[PDB]
Design a protein around this nucleic acid. Structure first.
Ligand code: MG
Ligand code: MG
Ligand code: MG
Ligand code: MG
Ligand code: MG
Ligand code: MG
Ligand code: MG
Ligand code: MG
Ligand code: MG
Ligand code: MG
Ligand code: MG
Ligand code: MG
Ligand code: MG
Ligand code: MG
Ligand code: MG
Ligand code: MG
Ligand code: MG
Ligand code: MG
Ligand code: MG
Ligand code: MG
Ligand code: MG
Ligand code: MG
Ligand code: MG
Ligand code: MG
Ligand code: MG
Ligand code: MG
Ligand code: MG
Ligand code: MG
Ligand code: MG
Ligand code: MG
Ligand code: MG
Ligand code: MG
Ligand code: MG
Ligand code: MG
Ligand code: MG
Ligand code: MG
Ligand code: MG
Ligand code: MG
Ligand code: MG
Ligand code: MG
Ligand code: MG
Ligand code: MG
Ligand code: MG
Ligand code: MG
Ligand code: MG
Ligand code: MG
Ligand code: MG
Ligand code: MG
Ligand code: MG
Ligand code: MG
Ligand code: MG
Ligand code: MG
Ligand code: MG
Lengths: 49, 96, 127, 172, 197, 106
RNA sequence: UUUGCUCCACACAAUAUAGAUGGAUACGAAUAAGGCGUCCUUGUGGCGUCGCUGAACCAUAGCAGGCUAGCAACGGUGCACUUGGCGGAAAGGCCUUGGGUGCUUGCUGGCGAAUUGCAAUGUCAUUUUGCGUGGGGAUAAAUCAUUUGUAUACGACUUAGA
RNA sequence: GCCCUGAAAAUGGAUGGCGCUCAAGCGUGUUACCUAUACUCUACCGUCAGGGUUGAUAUGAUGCCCUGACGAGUAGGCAGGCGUGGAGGUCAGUGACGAAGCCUAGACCGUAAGGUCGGGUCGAACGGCCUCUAGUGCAGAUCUUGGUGGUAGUAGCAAAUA
RNA sequence: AGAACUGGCGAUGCGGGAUGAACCGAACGUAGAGUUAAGGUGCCGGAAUACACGCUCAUCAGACACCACAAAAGGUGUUAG
RNA sequence: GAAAUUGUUGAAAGGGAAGGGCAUUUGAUCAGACA
C-alpha cells in the first residue's frame, strides 16, 4: 500500500548471487589498459595472506 | 577473446606438476612427459607455436606459478595462473 | 464362397468409448451418454469424441456380413449345424463356446460333408 | 464507386388525362451500370422537381461515348461535397483523355484528399477547358509548357524470383 | 534450387528479410545469412533506439532470468525478427530453424561461397528515397553489443583478400573472352549463333 | 550421363487448411519452376511419388513409395493440390517429392 | 575384470536419416548512379560499351553408361603421388611444381543390349554404432575409504598420503 | 484531410504476435485467390409420406417392391430396443472328453445399450427362443461397509542432570 | 434499474470477430466432389510482398463494426478547397 | 481368487503435467478372401 516510512533496501544487488565461489582462487576479470611503449613486465602477482 | 595456443616450458617443477593431479602419491606422474620431448627434435614444433602466437594474437599472458614450498603452509600443491603481459609489442612480449 | 455382395463398407470402425472412460478406472469403456448440463461432449464442441447416432448404420445390403460374406449362425450340435444345409453361400456356423472337444470333431466333420463353413474350426483341437 | 460510363438519362412524370405529354428532363449521369444510373437520375430529380419514381417514368437511357478518346484534354470540374461538419462547393481541374477517366480520378482524389466517399459527392459540371490560359490550377499548367521533357529517376524493376545474384541498379 | 542459400544481409530490410527467410525454411530451404550488421531498418536511428529500449524493459518481475531475453548482437536482433515468423514451439518449427544460420560478418566457408540478395527486401528497391533508416550495427552497438570494431577490422581484412581474388578472376576472363573470339566467325560458332548460342 | 531425372522436383508444403483446421486428405505441392496457375495447369494429372527409406527390407528393397497425383491448381503462384493413395505423413512438410511426366500429352 | 585403447585400410553385420538425385558458380562500393574494355596526363580523367534480370554461366551423348580399334591434338579432366606458397573469424580449406596413371563425346570405326514382357523409386545417397581378423602408434587416472580445516546442515569445497 | 500539441498510475507486455514507412498505414477503385457442419450433385442410414403386391406349388403381410421429402436440441413426452435375479412353456439345448466365474492393447457382428468366438485359468453346474414377474442396470448423494494409495521411509521417536 | 415490437442467448454446435453465452455468416444424420458466406491472402497461416490513384513521417505514428475510449482548444508540418 | 494398489521381467515414450479428436509414417500384431 506504501511502505509508511522510507528506508534504503538492505545490501547491494550487484553482488548476487550470494553463492559459494567456483574456486579458492578468485579470477582476474580485468587487466590494466595496455601501453606498448613501456618495457615488458607482469601485471599481477601471486601470494599468500 | 579466444585462446589460440599455449606454449609450455620444458622442465616443470613438481610443485606445478602436482596441481595437475588429485591423487599425486598413487600416480605415475606422467604429466607433460610427451610435451617435454618436443624440445629434443632441434626445437621445431615449439618454435612454430611461439612463432604462430607472434603472427596472430591480440594479447599475451604468461603462465606462472607460486613456489608454495617456500612458504610455511602445509599444502604442497602450488597455484598456477595466467598473467597478462603489458610491455610493448606482441613479439617483444612472447620473446620475454 | 458366399453370395456375391457389394464392397462391405463399415463407416466407423473405431469403438465409441465412454467419456472419461480413459480418465478414472471407475468409468467403464462401454458407451454411455452424457446428460450433464455444461458438458463439452454432449454439446459437440470441436475436439471431443463422437457419439453413436443413426447416421453410422450400415448398408441394409452388407449389414451383418463378416469379411467372408457369410452371416454367422451360432451352432451347438449337428442338428443346429444342419439348419444351414440349404444356405452354405449365405451363413457360416460358429461352434458354441461351451461345446466339448469331442463334440466339435463331429460337428466339424459333418459341416465338411455338407459344404457348410465353420468360423472357428480350431477350438479345442486336440493337436 | 467503380469504373464509369456516362449516361444520358431521360425521364418524365407519368401522363394524365389533363396533362398528357409532360415536360421531359435529361441528366448526364456518371455511373458504372445503367441500373445505378437510373437510380441516380431519380435521386437528383427529386432534389429538383415534384416527382418520385413511383409517379414518373424513364423515357430513355443511352451511353455517351467520348468524342476524341485519344486526344488529351484539360478538364475543369465542379463538385459539391459533404464534410464531417459541413457541406462545400469546390473546383478542381483534371487532365486526361476522356470525361469518363476524369471522373474516375476525381472520385479517387476526393476520397484521398478529403475522405469523401461516393454517397457524399455531387458532380455539378465537367467541361473541356477549350483554350489554355484559362487553365487555373498549377498542378496542371505545369504540364503545358513548351517542348516538355522529364526523367523518371530511381528505376525499380520488379524481381520475378525471390533470390537475385546481381545487386540491382536503379539506372534509367 | 541450391542446397544452401547464403544471403548478404547488407542493404536489406530486417522484417522483410525475416519474412522471406522464415518461409524458405518452412519449405525446406537451408539458409545462412551474412553481414547481419549491415542490415537496415526503416525509421531513423533514434526511433529504433527507442523501440529497443521498450523491449529492454520487459522482464519477469520476480526473476529477471525467467523473463524475456534481450540479445544485443545484430545477427540475433535479426533471428528474433525471424523466430516470431515461425511457429517455433512446434517440432516442425524447431526443424525449420535448424536450417537457419546468422552471422555478423562473413566467416569461413561462406566467404568463398557466393552470396545472393532478396530484391523484395532490398532497401534501395523498397524504401521511398528520402525516408530515413537505421543500420543494425550502429543500433546494436548502442544497446550493448561489443564487437562492431572487431568485425569491421576482420571485414576490411577479408575485403582486401577478395579484391585480389576478383582482380585475378577479371584478368583471366579477359583472356577467356579473347579466346572465345579467336574462334568467333568459325563454322561451329556461326552454327551456334543460329541456335541462340 | 550424370542426370537421369525424368521428374520435376517438388515440395510437400501443407495439408489443405483453414486458419485453425487442416484436412489431411489433400496435400499442397510447390512444383519447382512453376509460378502461375496457368503454368501449373500443365501438371494437372501428372503422378507424384513421395520416395522414402526404411529399415525393414520388404518386397526386396529398403525403399518405399507413397503414390499420388496432381488434382487442381491452388491459389495464384503455381502451387498445386494433390491427393495420395494414403495421406502423406506430415513430417513431410518441407520434404521433396517427385512429379512425373506421365500420363503424357505431348 | 580374462587382451584392453587409438589413428589408417575392407569386411561383415546392424542402425538410422526434417528429406542428394548435373554444379551453394566468392570483389568492393554506389543507387539523383555503376560494371566491363581501352587510352592516358593515373584522375572525382578521355573514349567505347553494357543493363531493361540467373530466360544465365558451367556441365550435359556412351550397360546408372559395357567391351574394343584408330586419328587429330599436347588440349581437358579424374585419381593417388611429389615442389613451392597462402589462409587463425569457426583458418581445417585455397593456389602452385613436376613425373605417373585412367578417361576424353575433338573426329572416325568394330562389338554388345531384347524376355525387367505396355507403368509400378524399381533400389546407384550418407548417419551413428557393433564385432572379427592386421598395417601404424600409445601404456593413465578418477572415485570410495583414510586424512587437513583456508570448507561444510548432508552432499560439495580444500589439503595430505608408496 | 493526414500528422503533431493538448494526453498523468501503479508486476514487464501487447494493432493476436513478428514486424511493416512510394507500407504489411489511412481513403477509394479493379481483378484474382483461400475456406463453414451452409448451397449444388451422388452414395449409404434412419424418420415421415404416397403408390404397388395374398396367387399358389417355398421361407418374414407387423412383410416384399417403387417413389418423394426431411434430420439441431436442455426440461420434458412418447417409441423401438440392450442387460440382470426369479416363474410357466419349449429346443428330447450345453456340460467333469470341463458348467459357471475370472484374465487377454487376439478375432468377428451391432450406430449403440451389448452380443459372439479363440487362448489362458477354473471346477459343477448353465444357456437360446415365446411368455410371466420384480428388491432389475450407478461415478458422484461431506452416500453405506470393506479394502487401497500419494503423502513417506517423511513428521517424528529431544521434559524428568548420566 | 424499469417498459414496447421483433430477433436471439438460455436449450446450440459449425465458419468468422486472436480470446469471449448473446455480434457477423450459417443452424448440425454418415460421407465423396464441387462452390461460396461472414471474414481474409508479408511471415506466423490456407490465399496476389496483386494492380491503380492520392494521403501520412509521429524523440510515446497508425492499423477495421459490436470492442475494449478520449475532449474543448491550438500548429507558419503538409495537402487540397 | 476381480479391482484399486504393489514387486520383478519385456517393450516404449518423456525440454514446466498427463489423458483425448481427425489423419497418416513407423514398429508390433492379426482376420478374411484366394485357389
Ligand atoms: Mg513512499
Ligand atoms: Mg560448483
Ligand atoms: Mg592449434
Ligand atoms: Mg454419466
Ligand atoms: Mg460445470
Ligand atoms: Mg449451460
Ligand atoms: Mg463527349
Ligand atoms: Mg528426422
Ligand atoms: Mg560508363
Ligand atoms: Mg577499369
Ligand atoms: Mg572514366
Ligand atoms: Mg553470369
Ligand atoms: Mg564413357
Ligand atoms: Mg560455420
Ligand atoms: Mg563408338
Ligand atoms: Mg585391434
Ligand atoms: Mg494503437
Ligand atoms: Mg497482421
Ligand atoms: Mg487500401
Ligand atoms: Mg457434410
Ligand atoms: Mg442431397
Ligand atoms: Mg433429433
Ligand atoms: Mg429383455
Ligand atoms: Mg430376466
Ligand atoms: Mg430377487
Ligand atoms: Mg471369428
Ligand atoms: Mg479353454
Ligand atoms: Mg469354463
Ligand atoms: Mg467340487
Ligand atoms: Mg418379458
Ligand atoms: Mg434397487
Ligand atoms: Mg452413471
Ligand atoms: Mg462407485
Ligand atoms: Mg466418485
Ligand atoms: Mg450422475
Ligand atoms: Mg464411495
Ligand atoms: Mg479408509
Ligand atoms: Mg524404516
Ligand atoms: Mg527424521
Ligand atoms: Mg534431554
Ligand atoms: Mg518433539
Ligand atoms: Mg435454466
Ligand atoms: Mg447458435
Ligand atoms: Mg473457431
Ligand atoms: Mg477483437
Ligand atoms: Mg506468430
Ligand atoms: Mg500462405
Ligand atoms: Mg493476381
Ligand atoms: Mg462506426
Ligand atoms: Mg481539432
Ligand atoms: Mg492543417
Ligand atoms: Mg485360494
Ligand atoms: Mg490412429
Amino acid at each position: 500500500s506504501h511502505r509508511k516510512y522510507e528506508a534504503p533496501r538492505h545490501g547491494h544487488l550487484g553482488f548476487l548471487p550470494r553463492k559459494r565461489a567456483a574456486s579458492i582462487r578468485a579470477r582476474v576479470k580485468a587487466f590494466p589498459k595496455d601501453d606498448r611503449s613501456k618495457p615488458v613486465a607482469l601485471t599481477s602477482f601471486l601470494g599468500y595472506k | 577473446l579466444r585462446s589460440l595456443t599455449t606454449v609450455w616450458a620444458e622442465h616443470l617443477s613438481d610443485e606445478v606438476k602436482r596441481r595437475f593431479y588429485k591423487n599425486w602419491y598413487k600416480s605415475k606422474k606422467k604429466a607433460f612427459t610427451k610435451y617435454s620431448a618436443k624440445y629434443a627434435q632441434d626445437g621445431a614444433g615449439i618454435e612454430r607455436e611461439l612463432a604462430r602466437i607472434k603472427k596472430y594474437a591480440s594479447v599475451v599472458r604468461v603462465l606462472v606459478h607460486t613456489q608454495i614450498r617456500k612458504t610455511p603452509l602445509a599444502q604442497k600443491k602450488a597455484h598456477l595462473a595466467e598473467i597478462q603481459l603489458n610491455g610493448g609489442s606482441i613479439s617483444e612480449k612472447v620473446d620475454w | 464362397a458366399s453370395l456375391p455382395h457389394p464392397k462391405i463398407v463399415k463407416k466407423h470402425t473405431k469403438k465409441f468409448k465412454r467419456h472419461h472412460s480413459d480418465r478414472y478406472h471407475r468409468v467403464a469403456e462401454n458407451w454411455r451418454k452424457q446428460k450433464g448440463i455444461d458438458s463439452v461432449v454432449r454439446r459437440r464442441f470441436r475436439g471431443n469424441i463422437s457419439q453413436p447416432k443413426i447416421g453410422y448404420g450400415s448398408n441394409k445390403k452388407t449389414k451383418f456380413l463378416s469379411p467372408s460374406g457369410h452371416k454367422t449362425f451360432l451352432v451347438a450340435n449337428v442338428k443346429d449345424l444342419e439348419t444351414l444345409t440349404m444356405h452354405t453361400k449365405t451363413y457360416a456356423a460358429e461352434i458354441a463356446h461351451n461345446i466339448s472337444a469331442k463334440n466339435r470333431v463331429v460337428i466339424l466333420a459333418r459341416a465338411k460333408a455338407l459344404g457348410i463353413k465353420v468360423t472357428n474350426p480350431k477350438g479345442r483341437l486336440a493337436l | 464507386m467503380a469504373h464509369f460510363k456516362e449516361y444520358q438519362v431521360i425521364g418524365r412524370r407519368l401522363p394524365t388525362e389533363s396533362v398528357p405529354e409532360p415536360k421531359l428532363f435529361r441528366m448526364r449521369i456518371f455511373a458504372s451500370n445503367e441500373v445505378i444510373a437510373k437510380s441516380r437520375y431519380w435521386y437528383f430529380l427529386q432534389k429538383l422537381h415534384k416527382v418520385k419514381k413511383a409517379s414518373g417514368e424513364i423515357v430513355s437511357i443511352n451511353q455517351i461515348n467520348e468524342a476524341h478518346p485519344t486526344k488529351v484534354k484539360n478538364f475543369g470540374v465542379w463538385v459539391r461535397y459533404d464534410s464531417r461538419s459541413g457541406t462545400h462547393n469546390m473546383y478542381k481541374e483534371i487532365r486526361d483523355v476522356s470525361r469518363v477517366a476524369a471522373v474516375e480520378t476525381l472520385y479517387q482524389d476526393m476520397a484521398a484528399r478529403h475522405r469523401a466517399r461516393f454517397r457524399s459527392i455531387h458532380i455539378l459540371k465537367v467541361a473541356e477547358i477549350e483554350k489554355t490560359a484559362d487553365v487555373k490550377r498549377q498542378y496542371v499548367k505545369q504540364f503545358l509548357t513548351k517542348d516538355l521533357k522529364f526523367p523518371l529517376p530511381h528505376r525499380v524493376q520488379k524481381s520475378t524470383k525471390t533470390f537475385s545474384y546481381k545487386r540491382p541498379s536503379t539506372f534509367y | 534450387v541450391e542446397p544452401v542459400v547464403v544471403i548478404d544481409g547488407k542493404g536489406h530490410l530486417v522484417g522483410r528479410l525475416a519474412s522471406v527467410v522464415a518461409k524458405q525454411l518452412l519449405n525446406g530451404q537451408k539458409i545462412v545469412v551474412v553481414r547481419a550488421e549491415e542490415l537496415n531498418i526503416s525509421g531513423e536511428f533514434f526511433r529504433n533506439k527507442l523501440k529497443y529500449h521498450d523491449f529492454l524493459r520487459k522482464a519477469t518481475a520476480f526473476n529477471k532470468t525467467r523473463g524475456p531475453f534481450h540479445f544485443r548482437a545484430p545477427s540475433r536482433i535479426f533471428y528474433k525478427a525471424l523466430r516470431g515468423m515461425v511457429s517455433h514451439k512446434t517440432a516442425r518449427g524447431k526443424a525449420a530453424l535448424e536450417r537457419l544460420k546468422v552471422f555478423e560478418g562473413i566467416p569461413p566457408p561462406y566467404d568463398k561461397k557466393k552470396r545472393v540478395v532478396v530484391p523484395q527486401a532490398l532497401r534501395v528497391l523498397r524504401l521511398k528515397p528520402g525516408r530515413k533508416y537505421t543500420t543494425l550495427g550502429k543500433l546494436s552497438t548502442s544497446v550493448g553489443w561489443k564487437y562492431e570494431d572487431v568485425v569491421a577490422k576482420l571485414e576490411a581484412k577479408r575485403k582486401v583478400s577478395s579484391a585480389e581474388y576478383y582482380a585475378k578472376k577479371r584478368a583471366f576472363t579477359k583472356k577467356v573472352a579473347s579466346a572465345n573470339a579467336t574462334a568467333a566467325e568459325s563454322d561451329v560458332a556461326k552454327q551456334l549463333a543460329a541456335l541462340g548460342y | 550421363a550424370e542426370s537421369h531425372r525424368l521428374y520435376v522436383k517438388g515440395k510437400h508444403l501443407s495439408y489443405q487448411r483453414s486458419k485453425r483446421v487442416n484436412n489431411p486428405n489433400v496435400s499442397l505441392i510447390k512444383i519447382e519452376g512453376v509460378a502461375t496457375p496457368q503454368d501449373a495447369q500443365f501438371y494437372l494429372g501428372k503422378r507424384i511419388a513421395y520416395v522414402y527409406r526404411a529399415s525393414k527390407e520388404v518386397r526386396g528393397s529398403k525403399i518405399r513409395v507413397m503414390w499420388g497425383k496432381v488434382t487442381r491448381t491452388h491459389g495464384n503462384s503455381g502451387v498445386v493440390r494433390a491427393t495420395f493413395r494414403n495421406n502423406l505423413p506430415a513430417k513431410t512438410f518441407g520434404a521433396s517429392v517427385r512429379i512425373f511426366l506421365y500420363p503424357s500429352n505431348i
